[PDB]
Design a protein around this ligand. Structure first.
Ligand SMILES: *[C@@H]1O[C@H](CO)[C@@H](O)[C@H](O)[C@H]1NC(C)=O
Ligand SMILES: *[C@@H]1O[C@H](CO)[C@@H](O)[C@H](O)[C@H]1NC(C)=O
Ligand SMILES: *[C@@H]1O[C@H](CO)[C@@H](O)[C@H](O)[C@H]1NC(C)=O
Lengths: 172, 322, 322, 172, 322, 172
């Protein structure tokens, strides 16, 4: 896309995941499964359900009667009215359409940045303790069980703890 | 070996296709549509207060009381006016109506509207008031607008005829009068006797002296004559002054009127059903928070902005990829 | 040693500059400009079907039939009207025209059109049909609007001018008339005999009456009198009855006429060339697709949104760096 | 620019590249030269092409005729019409101007993203097999012929293959 | 140890908040507001040239010469007009004013302008030029519109009154007349002697003949009568010719006129002060550069865009965080 | 924000900084302190300043007067008028309401980019002579005194200068 994450270095989506838009994927010695991220899948929905609640609520309604009200000797007037209505039609039509697009290119790229910003959240915590496969995954230079993963996730990974076990398998 | 942890995004079996500046037909996981394009097919009340319903009648034929209109509902308050594109029953006896559209604009919506006798048909002890016409026939026999009196000669004399009203009804009063333009001089004589006649009407603001215009015309409803109706708003406590020596189609009733602000007439061939709405269209009512719509241009009420657009689909989720 | 690979972008010899929210005078590799600003200095046919060119006459002068306008090119169909700012030849006999503007508008565009004879000049046996004036001079010899009949007195006697027409010409018909406003009491007497004359006209929907208002006036075109003109559209099958005791300026011709949708008048000095166009301006026609333009406000057809704007330059390429 | 690439960590642009918007320059034992990336340069051109169409096609024309038809006793109408035409010109003028400005800020950055994405798409495929010069180039910790260079441009680099030969040269 | 180098962004004690498409209520460092919302309460001149304060008068009161308006400042050039919603000093003698609205418009903005007499009061030697009235009386004594000569009978004879003038004031002239509409016959006779009178006015573009209409009306300001005023604009080098057998309320003065363009009337009660502005409103002026405002809709001048908006805060700094 | 920096991996901002927007903070043997980046601060200033001038300058105002103008037998015109003045109000209101919401977003993100693009302009020069702390700071593998930092700020840092000296502190 525009942040390269979605439909980019991460080739595709995970049907399996159902509890969110952004998530993780583990393949340690205790099988495999999916798990979305609360803190970032809620920041999303909030500012996206504050995007629709922005384009919708900022509109001014104002009570109006749109109708004829002109004789056959007031055809100049009718016409004037028509130029006006036509006028506001072309304006709102244009604006609305380009709003939809503009706000969609953004919405979509927003989702990208949201992901790419999470991948990095994790990458920048691990560093050399992992092989940056280059596809959204990280390979561990040490066995990482369930209690560990859930500390990479919740954002509390202990680097030093594994620093010395890992600089082993890395070199060789 | 070598354990792994991966980062990815949701996906599903969706087909909601949104568009973007750079790319069209993008499949995404979820989307909202902000283009209201669905109505309910029912013409409904507007803020609870309903439309005056005119059936096959026109505002004019309604106010004057074209017999075919006596079966209309007599609501004392409405929010807009329903009316067919080209009603059948208006000026049964042919003619015209001055500043007619302004009147229609005035009457498009009222807080209060009540018909009221002010110049009773029997007051004219000096004239004949039972005069009808075949163009205004009622069950075979000649008749006339149920709300006007058609003052004519009696005993071959049309004495100078006066009539007045001090507006003491608690609110401004719409009053309508008309003057008759006959086809030929022998018709003027037969109905009025005198000639060089005048119709004079007066208030603290209005002052007209109309002079009947006799002339030949194409029979319309078998009538060469024409009735030129005019109107005014007689303020409260203000008096109105009719005087004429011929050709005066005076009124019997006035209309007390109150306005909360105006609305508009909606052309349609349909009828009121028992439903509510903030926004009515010739095709149906609208109930929506959406910003835009394409239901129909001729709206009444508070309505979303009308656009010449087919679909307007925001994207809520992300891009759906296999 | 050490093999390398590098990633970088295009660049070129491009001066093209664009502005952005944050930066200005920015050079880019290439760009698209979406602001149309070049016409073609040619007044052209519209959507295929030519305009109408009164040249040096007005719609008044044209219709009435000012002698100076007999040489124009009869166009059964058109899509707009070309008229100088202040035409020289209009109402040769000085006066006014009622609902003139409203009329001009009606005519701006017409699916069909064709002058027709309705009330032959010599059918007026009761009165003369060859009166004229010096301000409609046809080479030293006095005359009148080629389509109008200045009915005058015959034998110190002005009968009752009665004339009709059933509109069977297969479609609506523009019809015109007027009333002479003489300079003094005596003149009225000279030309029409009767004083206190009137001019009545009637169709199924129209009833108008004019009455000469005698005032003293500057000799515009060496004439002190004035002729107030009035018009109507007589429906298929409806009839029009003239009836006057004096001052009635009759029609000899009507105009069959069909509409397909309004247009407009363009005040130009230039003339028509052999070309096509979807959108037209005083300066010349436009052939474009861009959203916007800035040639001339007064526009006619399918045109881009006029804007008070100098340049609209979209940056397609990328920032161009050495 | 906004993504750091164009006129950023890649100082300038190759006039040499003549076949696309964003491509590569290599130098191996076999020689040197440019060669733009078929995909990216096409994904972009499609975008931009689509962008100018959105802003043109989405405009409703209708059919108007502006003109007088206002007697000297209908000045107030003349004015309503003026106020109308003058109110719309303003709207359309300010809308165009700002459309451009916005649409321009975004186009330039699209090109930025596009470049940085290519850079990232290559980088992440090479890894510790190369020296990241930080000037928009990678120095190889192994020999890369042409059938090799291609594998990079084409997206099929075989890191595993040159993994061992490289960690060798890389250490010393 | 290990020397470090951290990177970060500016922050401060700012509470200023801005809104984004995704996040509401967001503190920033520096913000520029663009919604002008403060006036000054002082109705200042405009572009250097003052308004035209009228006070408790109507524009009708002004032009004619209602003695209650003698005190007004006759500035020859002005940019706009101030005038209460419901003035008191308008028509002392009840009546009406034709094309009043269009008129009020003409005289909204004027380049040049000057009151210049054209038909002297003492030129009426055959008539009485002092028959004022009570409702328009100065300090008890009956009086009349200072520029409006009330022609009445003298010598129990009312002979045709004539009035002619050639426009040679370099520019156009706004001349104003009126006819009288008496309540009963015995009033007409008492004043004009003749009966079936008339009032004719004439130029190259004008031509009216008013026939005084009589009727019975509620006494307004102790008068049953009414004066119906018309107006015109005499083109350079033209001639306006009156002619009246009675009822005419002739004009004594005329108004040279030149327009650069048009403005409009302001419904204020306040009074002009010694200041300046390019944008005036009922509630005050505006010295702002911002592109928007929410002051008052009814603005005059070169102005921001009036929006139904409370706040328009642009973020200029960066998200401020602890 | 959208570029993960401001309020992202650089949790908070610096009260201690007062001479520009974004800047540094060195912490060696000889003291410690803040130094905002005059370069990337005067470019963004020019940015924003030039932004607010676009939304202000491009507003073509013209000249008009509003008001009654209409009698009591002209209710219709009086209304048309209203349908217009209102019509435009609804437009100008909506446009500006959003125009802000957008511009505000793109502006806060512009900042986030400007911080990110600086943090990378530095990282990519330093490479493995330092230790990416994933907090906004790097820890030098060597002694980096004052006059050192200065060759970094003006972006002329000599990577070869501290290569071995630090490649020693790295491999233990
Ligand atoms: C797609 O999946 C949803 C549940 O997530 C299900 O309700 C729907 O029927 C599916 N669509 C089809 C047509 O397979
Ligand atoms: C009309 O009635 C009210 C109350 O009776 C009175 O004050 C007013 O003067 C009356 N008008 C006339 C014409 O008598
Ligand atoms: C209009 O423009 C098109 C190309 O945009 C051109 O092919 C055509 O000739 C033009 N039409 C005319 C009649 O000049």
């Amino acid at each position: 896309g525009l942040f390269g994450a979605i439909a980019g270095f991460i080739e595709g989506g995970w049907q399996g995941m159902v509890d969110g838009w952004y998530g993780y994927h583990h393949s340690n010695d205790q099988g495999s499964g999916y798990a979305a991220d609360k803190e970032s899948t809620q920041k999303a929905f909030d500012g996206i359900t504050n995007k629709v609640n922005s384009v919708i609520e900022k509109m001014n309604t104002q009570f109006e009667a749109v109708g004829k009200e002109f004789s056959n000797l007031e055809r100049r007037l009718e016409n004037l009215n028509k130029k006006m209505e036509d006028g506001f039609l072309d304006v709102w039509t244009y604006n609305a359409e380009l709003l939809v697009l503009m706000e969609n290119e953004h919405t979509l790229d927003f989702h990208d940045s949201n992901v790419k910003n999470l991948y990095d959240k994790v990458r920048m915590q691990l560093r050399d303790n992992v092989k940056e496969l280059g596809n959204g995954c990280f390979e561990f230079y040490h066995k990482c069980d369930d209690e560990c993963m859930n500390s990479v996730k919740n954002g509390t990974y202990d680097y030093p703890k594994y620093e010395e076990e890992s600089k082993l398998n890395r070199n060789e | 070996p070598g354990d792994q942890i991966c980062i990815g995004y949701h996906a599903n079996n969706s087909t909601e296709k949104v568009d973007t500046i750079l790319e069209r037909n993008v499949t995404v996981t979820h989307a909202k549509d902000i283009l209201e394009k669905t109505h309910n097919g029912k013409l409904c009340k507007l803020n609870g207060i309903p439309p005056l319903e005119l059936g096959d009648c026109s505002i004019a034929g309604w106010l004057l009381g074209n017999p075919e209109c006596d079966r209309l509902l007599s609501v004392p308050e409405w929010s807009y006016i329903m009316e067919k594109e080209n009603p059948r029953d208006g000026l049964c006896y042919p003619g015209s109506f001055n500043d007619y559209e302004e009147l229609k604009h005035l009457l498009s919506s009222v807080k209060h509207f009540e018909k009221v006798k002010i110049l009773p048909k029997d007051r004219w002890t000096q004239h004949t008031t039972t005069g009808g016409s075949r163009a205004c026939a009622v069950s075979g026999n000649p008749s006339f607008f149920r709300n006007m009196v058609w003052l004519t000669e009696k005993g071959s004399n049309y004495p100078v005829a006066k009539g007045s009203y001090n507006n003491t009804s608690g609110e401004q009063m719409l009053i309508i009068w008309g003057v008759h333009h006959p086809n030929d001089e022998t018709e003027q004589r037969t109905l009025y006797q005198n000639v060089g006649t005048y119709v004079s009407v007066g208030t603290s603001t209005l002052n007209k002296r109309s002079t009947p215009e006799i002339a030949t015309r194409p029979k319309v409803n078998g009538q060469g004559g024409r009735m030129e109706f005019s109107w005014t708003l007689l303020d409260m406590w203000d008096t109105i002054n009719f005087e004429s020596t011929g050709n005066l189609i005076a009124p019997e009733y006035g209309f007390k009127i109150s306005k909360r602000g105006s609305s508009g007439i909606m052309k349609t061939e349909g009828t009121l059903e028992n439903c509510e709405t903030k926004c009515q269209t010739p095709l149906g009512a609208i109930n929506t928070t959406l910003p835009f719509h394409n239901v129909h241009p001729l709206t009444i009420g508070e309505c979303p902005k009308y656009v010449k657009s087919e679909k307007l689909v925001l994207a809520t989720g992300l891009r759906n990829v296999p």
